[PDB]
Amino acid sequence: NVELFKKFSEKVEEIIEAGRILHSRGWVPATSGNISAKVSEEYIAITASGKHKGKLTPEDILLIDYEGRPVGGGKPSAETLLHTTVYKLFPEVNAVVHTHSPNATVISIVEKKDFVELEDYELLKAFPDIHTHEVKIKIPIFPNEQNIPLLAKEVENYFKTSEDKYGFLIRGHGLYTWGRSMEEALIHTEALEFIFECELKLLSFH
Amino acid sequence: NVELFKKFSEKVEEIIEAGRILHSRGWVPATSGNISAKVSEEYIAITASGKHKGKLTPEDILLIDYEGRPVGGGKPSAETLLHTTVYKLFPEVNAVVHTHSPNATVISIVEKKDFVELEDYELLKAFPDIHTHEVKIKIPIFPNEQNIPLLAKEVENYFKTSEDKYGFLIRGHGLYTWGRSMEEALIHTEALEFIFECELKLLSFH
Amino acid sequence: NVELFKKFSEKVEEIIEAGRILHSRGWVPATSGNISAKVSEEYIAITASGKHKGKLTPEDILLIDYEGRPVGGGKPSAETLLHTTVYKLFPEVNAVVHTHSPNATVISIVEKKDFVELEDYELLKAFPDIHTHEVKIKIPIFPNEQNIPLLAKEVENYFKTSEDKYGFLIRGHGLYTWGRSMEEALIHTEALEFIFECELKLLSFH
Amino acid sequence: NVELFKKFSEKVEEIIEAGRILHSRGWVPATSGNISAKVSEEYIAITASGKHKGKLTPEDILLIDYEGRPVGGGKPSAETLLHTTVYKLFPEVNAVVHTHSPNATVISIVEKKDFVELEDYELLKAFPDIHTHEVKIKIPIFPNEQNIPLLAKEVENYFKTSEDKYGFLIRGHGLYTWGRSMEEALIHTEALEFIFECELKLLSFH
Ligand SMILES: [Cl-]
Ligand SMILES: [Cl-]
Ligand SMILES: [Cl-]
Ligand SMILES: [Cl-]
């Protein structure tokens, strides 16, 4: 079976910790959000969807394949499909974080354009990874597509053709980001959650 | 006397902890709110109304009957009647939480409709209990009925005939939720408090 | 010299703790606010005005008389006069807390009427002391009177003739409350700070 | 080499702590902001720009000269130039703090005038250092000048000719303050961040 058990357990502890941190920020209320971490080139560790991310225990962490399918046999879910999609788009990514903050939810409902943009040299330093011809951090907003494979399709199309790879928003579902490490993903989450705060606060005088 | 003393003491510790958690969220300011836990099919443990939920001690926890009456003889109160009402409506419920957050209070005053609604698949996972023909989490708002038995009446009528059983709001009094366990009730409280946040924030641009 | 030293030291520790609690709430930013505690019928312990209430040490606590004068000889200050005023109005009061929250400051500037009112049975339980013919918690707002003795005069007149004795606001200076114990004062502060939150939030849609 | 190593290490620990405090306030999200401390009349310790101020370790602290140049040879940066500028303007200053809060960022975008003002006797006590003919705490706003030496020029001109020396804002970059000690700088930061809160909240009803 190899040393998967070793890496899996490490990701379990990594995810439980990430969950306590997210919760302390008010970004994963009452079961919303989800967290995943790369176990190996064949398996991913992902938080069970109905569990509160702020009180995880080993039993709440599931092991799936790059097809979003649960190793112990099963059918993929929207969340499981969406994470694997991220892993496939960015081979360097080892962690995916989905938050569901009040600001993200609200922005998902009032933003008329299909993206949120800000331009913050200050915040760019959080994405030393991304090289682009712009200085504006951009966050694409995807529709609440009930058709999962199509939603995935649009996300792939966007990121395959876009220089910016900060994260994305799915209206009525929440924010998604990722990183080469859980630390990098959390940092990205914070950066984006910050933008959502400014974006709205602006639209409280506009 | 049986092992009531055993269960009572466990609920005391459960309630004091729930109170510290609620307070840390700013949901039980200066004595507002109240917490109750099922001791047995004949008794309920409830927080004394004039005590700060964030600094409870065993002496602040009262023992009442399913009639809202204080075991040591006494006359029921509005709060005591309202909780027992919840216990009677839902036999599976073992804990009731009443919060009084700034958002809930405000919503109690500005919402024109008699309910708050949102629709959040994400948040629905917090109510694995409820099965309905809708995807919108709904929260009924009841009037500041001075006539307690009538208020109770309306709450009973609503929930006896409604598929949704998330919680309810009493204008000028606060939010009410419940769960099969204190943990489940707290999680529900968070989910609903989240909706109140988005609801208002929306109405800051509408 | 008696056992003043005993009581003084107890109030020192009481005040330092009250200060850490206030600061954690964001109610005493950068030196604003002040805290006082009754040492005896002849002396009061009060926090030095230029010290940050969230990092007090014994050296930051001053001992004054019921005349606001610093025992070691000196001339009274506005703050010292205002607290002694409170102590004189309410003989049962042993602690006075002055906070300076963003909400209080803002309310001090936008409220057109000379008082803030709310009516919250829920919050009334925080003032088991006050008996009145009303159900609305009321907070009088006094002008930024440069003439200290006149400001004091108006405060005395108000409370000598008013049934409500929750606390008061001095525009451009901050909120004031008190209690038979520091715990009671802090609880009152929270109750009033809560009202300031709702009051404004309302005026974000009105 | 002298005892620089002694002082440097002390500033390292001072800066890491300041960073944890700033982060807990939500003022240095995802790498934004920066912190510096005077090591000697020839060297300054400054936080690396791309590191998260809330998770600093000795390796993230750089040593530069009063010319903003990195001792180990290198070319100055905007941040490094801006801090040294502050150190040169105020010889008593031993610490510089740059925050990047949601409020500061937002204010940087909506404030039409080139400064923010408030007038708060209460807050003035936080600046026992500054003597002026006014009672209003003033914060000058400088443009997002890509031309660094010119930005520096304007900042110097302002403070060389202004009685107020509370701090300043660079649109799209963040708030800057300083103090004779890190504690004094943090206190100033809080005072200014408070004003930004009130300023906006006002402009939510104006
Ligand atoms: Cl807003
Ligand atoms: Cl709002
Ligand atoms: Cl507001
Ligand atoms: Cl606002």
From Swiss-Prot, chains A, B, C, D:
Q: What class of enzyme is it?
A: lyase
PANTHER family reported in the protein's UniProt record: 3-OXO-TETRONATE 4-PHOSPHATE DECARBOXYLASE-RELATED, FUCULOSE PHOSPHATE ALDOLASE
Briefly, what is this protein's role? Catalyzes the dehydration of methylthioribulose-1-phosphate (MTRu-1-P) into 2,3-diketo-5-methylthiopentyl-1-phosphate (DK-MTP-1-P).
GO terms (molecular function) for this protein are: methylthioribulose 1-phosphate dehydratase activity; zinc ion binding
Q: Which gene carries the instructions for this protein?
A: mtnB
Q: Which cofactor does it need?
A: Zn(2+)
Q: What is its EC number?
A: 4.2.1.109
List, in alphabetical order, the GO biological process terms annotated in this UniProt record: L-methionine salvage from methylthioadenosine
Q: Which NCBIfam families match?
A: PRK09220.1 (NF006672), salvage_mtnB (TIGR03328)
Q: Which reaction does it catalyse?
A: 5-(methylsulfanyl)-D-ribulose 1-phosphate = 5-methylsulfanyl-2,3-dioxopentyl phosphate + H2O
Q: Which GO terms describe its cellular component?
A: cytoplasm
Pathway annotation from the record = Amino-acid biosynthesis; L-methionine biosynthesis via salvage pathway; L-methionine from S-methyl-5-thio-alpha-D-ribose 1-phosphate: step 2/6
| InterPro entries with a match to the protein in the record | Aldolase_class_II_sugar_metab (IPR050197), Aldolase_II/adducin_N (IPR001303), Aldolase_II/adducin_N_sf (IPR036409), MethylthioRu-1-P_deHdtase_MtnB (IPR017714)
Descriptive protein name: Methylthioribulose-1-phosphate dehydratase
Annotated Zn(2+) binding sites: 98, 100
UniProt entry keywords in alphabetical sequence: Amino-acid biosynthesis, Lyase, Metal-binding, Methionine biosynthesis, Zinc
Show the Pfam families listed in the entry: Aldolase_II
